[model samples]
Target: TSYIEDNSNQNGAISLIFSLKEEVGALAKVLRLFEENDINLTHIESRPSRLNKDEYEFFTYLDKRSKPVLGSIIKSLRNDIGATVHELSRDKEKNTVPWFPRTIQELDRFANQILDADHPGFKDPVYRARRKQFADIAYNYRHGQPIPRVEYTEEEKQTWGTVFRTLKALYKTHACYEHNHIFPLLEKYCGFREDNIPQLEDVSQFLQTCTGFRLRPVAGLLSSRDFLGGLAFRVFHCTQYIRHGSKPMYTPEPDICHELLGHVPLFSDRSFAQFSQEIGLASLGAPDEYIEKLATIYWFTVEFGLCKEGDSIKAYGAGLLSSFGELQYCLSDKPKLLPLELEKTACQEYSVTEFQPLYYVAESFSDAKEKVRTFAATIPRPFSVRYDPYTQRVEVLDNTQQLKILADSINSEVGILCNA
Candidate 1:
């Protein structure tokens, strides 16, 4: 009951955005200021500025009650480090805004419009398949690569230590009890000891064994089908960075905490793991048009998904799990919580800029997998209908032979791969 304490309105947390051009010593100065003022700095990190690669966006958090001290310290930091303040906001009720795109008919229209367009990245079937394979092999092989040996600052070490300790305590009572299995296995397979920072290669290797997936470090947002296909094949799109001691609570991008801490654990579950793999296999041979639709399903469910817990809703999606803001909001006093339904969920639209208003929850992970498997079977086969981009229409094929051919091609590929 103490965990339910009214800390949402607590003014102890404040997010301070800064732009730092100086070296680590400048960071040290900020740290010392927090120390001198007895202010607890909870999170800090730097991200590549979307506008300028040479510059970076640095975000930091501190106990908001230390605002008076922060005021003087920030002044000194501005003068000493040339750190520009971006935004200062009180950490209040954390919420996720729902992303509401146009209607399903519109989405279909959009898909049709883009069907003929060439994929921006690696779209060649051979190249895409090879890329998937390369990711798998590299991730598996990198298991033994040396874990990064950089020494964590006392502050950094303490932060991670506290985080692991706290989460392990909560895992004992949580439903998806796989983190307990994952952390140790990752350590053993990847040689990622608890004594140092975890290496991506090592984590990937361990993940491969747990579920035939590999790590694909991508740059931008991807479609639900692409994400699911990756999952079905046991591949995960991960970023190459980790959050520093200054920014533990939030990051605009997917960092190691989101990838390894939030995702890796769930891969240990049998049903969840199997379903993810199937999703990849389903999308592996899918056309560009269908892939977009698949992406929506994945985005709403896996990354930003929720589950029902008795009469109340609980968070299970990775995006929410690793998010300090959304984690609290999804379970808090705001937002609509609906029971999980596949067909209805698949038809719903979402907005990318805000929190999810609707979430599809499965009776169990097995239930989720079964639905996806059925959907995969129903997806239109390649070349059955010419996908016309400009007209925004799919010319449904009456070619039953083409459907069978597509089915055989997919089956043969899967069979050979399995045999190999």
Candidate 2:
């Protein structure tokens, strides 16, 4: 919380900083960046960069009269304007910083914000600030770089424990074999005890060793394209914050419990992991119309998907597996159960406020995995990908690709795609 003012009641004024190349028209692009977001500038200032001789620092002092988030604006500046916008530290005859508070307090408020009937996540300024903060660090994560880690309040732990126990009981009776088996394995290494909360770093390591997927901390729920899109890169963006303590089992939307227990276990399974990546791969260049259907495919299969065990249907979807009441309700004779179909499942309507009225259950994990991949192939794309776990990235086989050459390269390296 940088206190520019009570911009909460109304838009206040602040310096929008950017570093521009001396080349022609660079400054114009910076102004256009803010303009695209409906942010109007009050004044502009520039000076030679002390660090980079090739670039000049530009600051547009603007009244915060619109919905543009400080962080989102900075991101656009970095990605679009090709500039490194500086941070606000305080009063800087020309530069310095702002209030930036809300660590513990921010966590509690965010949960309730989602729980509130009218909370539109992107509209919340506080949420946007933290979301941007985490993304700044997590998006740049590499093999050896330090990952963002946060301290959990005692209250936060209790909330996690409450859901952990509830989710645990759901798994005890309702979860599929793969998830149940992997839960203990993950708990062993990831500090997933009922009373303990694991950081993203530990879970990231656990998932990498089990599968090729990488865990990145997101502030909150992301757009379907961005979230599912990351899947193409084998990245699952998740909320680092826990849900409100009082309403541990219920959240308006995505929370850590739903993120962690719901999704991570499936990432451990070889077929399931590939199934997820394929959905991600398919999202590339997909039309918004099918992108929605693709999200629907992910929803029924990954988000709220189910699988049949030897004698009974078991929960695999994050919505059910990580949930307590909904999971129990789902296992009972409530929702309309149907065979998982690519087109049908993708088209069916569902709700987030209440338990889903319909759920498509797979014959088995292997069965579900195949169906998802089958659907992925049906989606038209610019290219095809063969996941090269040996090289640790998605491999594209274009105009001149010999299968044996790709296979030989993989064979020469890590060999098989999955540990299993």
Candidate 3:
């Protein structure tokens, strides 16, 4: 009873034990009382009663209702049916898949991937062992802890050096204004230079200062739902290991080089950061069909996205940004280029194994951001969400009380604007 009083906001559980004679209608009549009392029964167990050798004791599990209503019902059970009631201990709540993480600690459970058999490092036992060491760091990592640094071998550093020199040179001409602006800062602050692989801790800390975005080391590729969910909290799950040194210029998947050289710069830009997180915010609690569409949007925008600076398209997508070979090709006349349309881009099929056959160009980062926000408005979630930075949680705006609180905040901000 005290438990029900304290836990009024959530469902409660109770056990009902009663003895009945070996008769059909006797058990049915007792069950009828629960129905009459408006108690919902979930399960029942029966055994021989200790006091009455001829009677059976039946135990029932119930979903509790309101305190006053449940109190009156339990009283009736004791007086009328002569049943003993006990509060059953609650169990941990279970979450379903197509799930969004509620906290950063939940990330460890989601860090997982199986290398495709055709992956470049698939055949090398030594490289695979090195990859496992990196994956283990992410698997064992917890939130609020420092990301461990990797001791890169000369071969790994040399590989990164090669990729670095080749890609950095192209940024001045091919990369967007946002990427170009942040690249030098990353070099100056986060050690984005040749002959060195920067640690995630240092880089994440730098990004935090720049745009409130931070990085988490990942095992490998994540499901679209899990990857985008991190962005809602301004988190980016990054792969720590570099690609196989044998192929310094190419990788079958995202590696340290791909993330650092391609994704990290724009993440430090405020407008681009917000645009990325908007895609993330729309992904949470969405249906499977909607998640698929959002993934396509992510693929076209974040992974292989482009923006117009004047007449020419600039490479902002990580795939185009990291690949020196495809960087030039994508900007050339080889692939089909089109303006980013929410309807077509959300369903457009793409090839991962090769240079993209098509690309979507945005008018600008803000233009793309507006289109995505408009498209996200069409997602089929019943409630809206806002990330509470202080609490580090997503607040669901479903009730009138929450809405009124939001309205008050908006009204206050509008007043300040008017005064100005």
The pairs that clash in candidate 3 are: none
TM-scores of all predicted structures: 0.49, 0.64, 0.76
Clash count, candidate 2? 11
Q: Compute the lDDT of residue 164 as modeled in candidate 1.
A: 52
Task: State the lDDT at 391 in candidate 3.
Answer: 58
TM-score winner, 1 or 3: 3
- Score residue 172 of candidate 1 by CA lDDT: 42
Q: How many residue pairs clash in each candidate?
A: 24, 11, 0
Ranking by TM-score: 3, 2, 1
Residue-by-residue lDDT tens digits, candidate 1, 1-420? 000111122443354544444455755766676677765555554454332334454545444466577668767767766654533332222221111111112121111110013332234454345334423432333322433333334554554555455554554444243445555666566543434556666676666666654565543334443344345435576654444444466455455667766777677666677766555555543544445556666666677776654665555677765655566566655777666665566566777546766666656677777777777776644312223223322222234544565578789899989975
Off by over 4 Å in 1: 1-175, 179-196, 217-226, 244-246, 287-289, 308-314, 352-354, 383-420
Model 2, which residues run further than 4 Å from truth?
Answer: 1-144, 400-420
lDDT of each: 0.51, 0.64, 0.74
Better of 1 and 3 by lDDT: 3
Candidate 2 C-alpha lDDT tens digits along 1-420: 000111121333344444567777876776676667766554455555443456665645554443346668777777866654544322212233331111111111111111034544455566556555654554454433545787666866898998888778668788888898899998889998988889888898888898767776654555565566567656676777666554566776577788889999888888788778777767654545666788878878887887888778888888888778788888889778899888687777776677788888888667766776777777655345554444343333332324556566678677565555
